[PDB]
Design a protein around this ligand. Structure first.
Ligand SMILES: [Ca+2]
Ligand SMILES: [Ca+2]
Ligand SMILES: [Ca+2]
Ligand SMILES: [Ca+2]
Ligand SMILES: [Zn+2]
Length: 316
């Protein structure tokens, strides 16, 4: 919509107060004109017809519980935008400041969130397994990273390339959580998962096996469920990225950690320069090694750590 850029205030899903960039034209809309060609948040109104209506508010105050998921979708989209721009010099998901669009209140009791090829979509959860999914910065950045992958490597969403596509989203979703720096960790979705249970999440990068995911290639899932295990086998790559950043000994193989910033650089470079739609795990290892070599040199600690991390998870 055409109007003036304004600044509203509201509460997110977890009761935290924040400012949001809005646009004024009769109503105050969730339209942030300060980043690229806009960040736009819509109301799906418990339906599945997308995008729904551009979110409109009478007074620029967003404190109703109905407002909360839209507050977070809009705000965390802006944080993720800032991360890619400030850290990777990437403008929006296509690298050309494409508008970022999100719809919240999708369906009824919908325990999931996803990128549909054109926009972000968040359920409200059923209140037991999930609360509104946009309350998790790692969930928002996970899903926006799928848009990044779709415009770069284009990793096919099946089998090994699919598990890479998943891992990449877990990695950058986690690096975005650390960038925003509110209770960061190496688990996925903990802020919005199971409000009755402390300390759990959907997935762990530091210990995939915690939730039944493989942490070594010899444990890969080779069946047909979950598109050949894209959310299951990502554990192998998640563990490798955790090792590259943090270090550790995993099945007897020791890895020297190089930290989050370097992990982010190496994997962003692999994603955007080396990976292709059909890349398998072994080709990921070569891309990450070539990335680390470009960035730090072939004799570097960084290259040696990438090789050790992939050895530790059984990927040659
Ligand atoms: Ca209001
Ligand atoms: Ca956290
Ligand atoms: Ca997390
Ligand atoms: Ca929980
Ligand atoms: Zn995903």
């Amino acid at each position: 919509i055409t109007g003036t850029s304004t600044v509203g205030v509201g509460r997110g899903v977890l009761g935290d107060q924040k400012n949001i960039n809005t646009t004024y034209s009769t109503y105050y809309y969730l339209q942030d004109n300060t980043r690229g060609d806009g960040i736009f948040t819509y109301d799906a109104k418990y339906r599945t017809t997308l995008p729904g209506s551009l979110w409109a508010d009478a007074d620029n105050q967003f404190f109703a519980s109905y407002d909360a998921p839209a507050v977070d979708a809009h705000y965390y989209a802006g944080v993720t935008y800032d991360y890619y721009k400030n850290v990777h010099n990437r403008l929006s998901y296509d690298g050309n400041n494409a508008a970022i669009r999100s719809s919240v209140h999708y369906s009824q009791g919908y325990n999931n969130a996803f990128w549909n090829g054109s926009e972000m979509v968040y359920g409200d959860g059923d209140g037991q397994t999930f609360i509104p999914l946009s309350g998790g910065i790692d969930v928002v950045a996970h899903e926006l990273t799928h848009a990044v992958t779709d415009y770069t490597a284009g990793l096919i969403y099946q089998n090994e390339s699919g598990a890479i596509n998943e891992a990449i989203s877990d990695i950058f979703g986690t690096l975005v959580e650390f960038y925003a720096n509110k209770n960061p960790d190496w688990e996925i979705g903990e802020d919005v998962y199971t409000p009755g249970i402390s300390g759990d999440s959907l997935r762990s990068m530091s210990d995939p096996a915690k939730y039944g995911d493989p942490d070594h290639y010899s444990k890969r899932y080779t069946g047909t469920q979950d598109n050949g295990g894209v959310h299951i086998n990502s554990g192998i790559i998640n563990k490798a990225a955790y090792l590259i950043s943090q270090g550790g000994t995993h099945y007897g193989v020791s890895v020297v950690g190089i930290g989050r910033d370097k992990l982010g650089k190496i994997f962003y470079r692999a994603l955007t320069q080396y990976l292709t739609p059909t890349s398998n795990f072994s080709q990921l290892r070569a891309a990450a090694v070539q990335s680390a070599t470009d960035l730090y040199g072939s004799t570097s600690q960084e290259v040696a750590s990438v090789k050790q991390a992939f050895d530790a998870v059984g990927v040659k």
